[PDB]
Amino acid sequence: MELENIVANTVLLKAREGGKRKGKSKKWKEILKFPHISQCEDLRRTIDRDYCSLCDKQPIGRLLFRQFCETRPGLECYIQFLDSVAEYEVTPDEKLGEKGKEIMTKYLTPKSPVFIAQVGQDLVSQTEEKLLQKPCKELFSACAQSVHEYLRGEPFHEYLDSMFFDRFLQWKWLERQPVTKNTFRQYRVLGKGGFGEVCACQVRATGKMYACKRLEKKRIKKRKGESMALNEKQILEKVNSQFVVNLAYAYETKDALCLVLTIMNGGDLKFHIYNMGNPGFEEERALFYAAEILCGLEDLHRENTVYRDLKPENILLDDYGHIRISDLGLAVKIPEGDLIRGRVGTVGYMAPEVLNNQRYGLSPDYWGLGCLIYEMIEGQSPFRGRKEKVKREEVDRRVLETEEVYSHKFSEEAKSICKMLLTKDAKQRLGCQEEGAAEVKRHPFFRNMNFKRLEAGMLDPPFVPDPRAVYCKDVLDIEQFSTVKGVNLDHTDDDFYSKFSTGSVSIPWQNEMIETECFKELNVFGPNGTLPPDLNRNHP
Numbered sequence: 001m002e003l004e005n006i007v008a009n010t011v012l013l014k015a016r017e018g019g020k021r022k023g024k025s026k027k028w029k030e031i032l033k034f035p036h037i038s039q040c041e042d043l044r045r046t047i048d049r050d051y052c053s054l055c056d057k058q059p060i061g062r063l064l065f066r067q068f069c070e071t072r073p074g075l076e077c078y079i080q081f082l083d084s085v086a087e088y089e090v091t092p093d094e095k096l097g098e099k100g101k102e103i104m105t106k107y108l109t110p111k112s113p114v115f116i117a118q119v120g121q122d123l124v125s126q127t128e129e130k131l132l133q134k135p136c137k138e139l140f141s142a143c144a145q146s147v148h149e150y151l152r153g154e155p156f157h158e159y160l161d162s163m164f165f166d167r168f169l170q171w172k173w174l175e176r177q178p179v180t181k182n183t184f185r186q187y188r189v190l191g192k193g194g195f196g197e198v199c200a201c202q203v204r205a206t207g208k209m210y211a212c213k214r215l216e217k218k219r220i221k222k223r224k225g226e227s228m229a230l231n232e233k234q235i236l237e238k239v240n241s242q243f244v245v246n247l248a249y250a251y252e253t254k255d256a257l258c259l260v261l262t263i264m265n266g267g268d269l270k271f272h273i274y275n276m277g278n279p280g281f282e283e284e285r286a287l288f289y290a291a292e293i294l295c296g297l298e299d300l301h302r303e304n305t306v307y308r309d310l311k312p313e314n315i316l317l318d319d320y321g322h323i324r325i326s327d328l329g330l331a332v333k334i335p336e337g338d339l340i341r342g343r344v345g346t347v348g349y350m351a352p353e354v355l356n357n358q359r360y361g362l363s364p365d366y367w368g369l370g371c372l373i374y375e376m377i378e379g380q381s382p383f384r385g386r387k388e389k390v391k392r393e394e395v396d397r398r399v400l401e402t403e404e405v406y407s408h409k410f411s412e413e414a415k416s417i418c419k420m421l422l423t424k425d426a427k428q429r430l431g432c433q434e435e436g437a438a439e440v441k442r443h444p445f446f447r448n449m450n451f452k453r454l455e456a457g458m459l460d461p462p463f464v465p466d467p468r469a470v471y472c473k474d475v476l477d478i479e480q481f482s483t484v485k486g487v488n489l490d491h492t493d494d495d496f497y498s499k500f501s502t503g504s505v506s507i508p509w510q511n512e513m514i515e516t517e518c519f520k521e522l523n524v525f526g527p528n529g530t531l532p533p534d535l536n537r538n539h540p
């Protein structure tokens, strides 16, 4: 046992768990100290006054507007209804009826205890007629839309005039603070990327755990990849999906550019396939993972963006067992009506169209989904052996010519979804046609997978990683780069560095404050709902 291997993980595991100060800096209350509201006049001018952004999408602003609504009983009742419609939207599909009636009898009646007077009588009656017809979780959608149409009016304008929006401006003043290497503390390397290495890092003030994808400036230049780096960053930010790694920071360094990403302490799937017992795992695990991978691919294809690099090592597991797609550097956004043409990908996972320099759309991803489902069931790549040292020229040859081979491990449904997703003609490939992912979601393979409860987070993952385990190779077994030489950086690269490095992302940052309880603890106003001194303009 090598000491460096041991110490590297015992440290990571200690920070991961916690536990005094929750892992925060000793002076975190001074770092995140609110400015005086008099310091937020610039923000006052530039902030866009949007109800949906300031009172729902922006996490801290959604809680500050609810705190304002709960200051007046006339507005709190609405917040109660909306919260009640949320429960009904995630309650048992059989108990919908009784709970839908509870809401109807609690909020939408002439003398209901918490009567909402802006929903509209026709609407409640329409909703009350459909109550019987059949109970669906979308039943109350319109009622809540009527509440939001009323809250975006006078209530929103009064919030903007309140001390709670002043507090939001303070929070935003903190959000926009600069990011730097001193903002985080780096831990062990979790894996090696294309331009650098992924590490585990921790925000020093909040204690939140992340993963830093370092992209070494010299390496980006040596390999002409300045557009791949920017594309990955812009992509990660544009996308929103519970099944794709999300971006929270993006800062620059003397020698590298960094992407702070969601940490996946469960590890990558290649590790769970080859370094944890027998090759491959059970179909049930493969079912769940393939389903979420598909969901993540549906979220990407909504923005007409292809991935082109689907392989086990780019699928990760989180604290609970759900997965996300990780290296979006090879992804591109095809023109909504045009197709692309580039031989990009990892051998054994490049689809036939991408192998003959043909032109393709969002197609090579469904080939990659089949390559995965096969590898998770069998224990090898469909067209290559585990440790076969086959020249990749031949690996190509096989995928276009030979046909994959199945075994007793594959079920009838598992063998079909693979054989349809591995169709060597894009037109005739499952999902590559017209319906889209919906043709996959019906396949006999997923005959027991409710992609609705899956996309909602109701299904429990099959495998749950153990907190006191590092589902990763040892640090000394991670491959290393070869020192770059002769690529001395200059000025013309400074324009791309400034465009890449945009600081913190708004919504992730605010979530980080909520989760770490920094918001909870520092978002204190005065006694009996009085102006605190940092919001009082009569004196600092």
Ligand SMILES: NC(=O)c1cn([C@@H]2O[C@H](CO)[C@@H](O)[C@H]2O)c2ncnc(N)c12
Residues within 6 Å of the ligand: 190, 191, 192, 193, 198, 211, 213, 245, 261, 262, 263, 264, 265, 267, 268, 313, 314, 316, 325, 326, 327, 472
């Ligand atoms: N999203 C990423 O870029 C990540 C890459 N790795 C590791 O780094 C390796 C790079 O291929 C993977 O196999 C993982 O072990 C990660 N490990 C944890 N969280 C992450 N967000 C990543």
Ligand SMILES: [K+]
Residues within 6 Å of the ligand: 272, 273, 274, 275, 276, 277, 278, 279, 280, 281
């Ligand atoms: K295994």
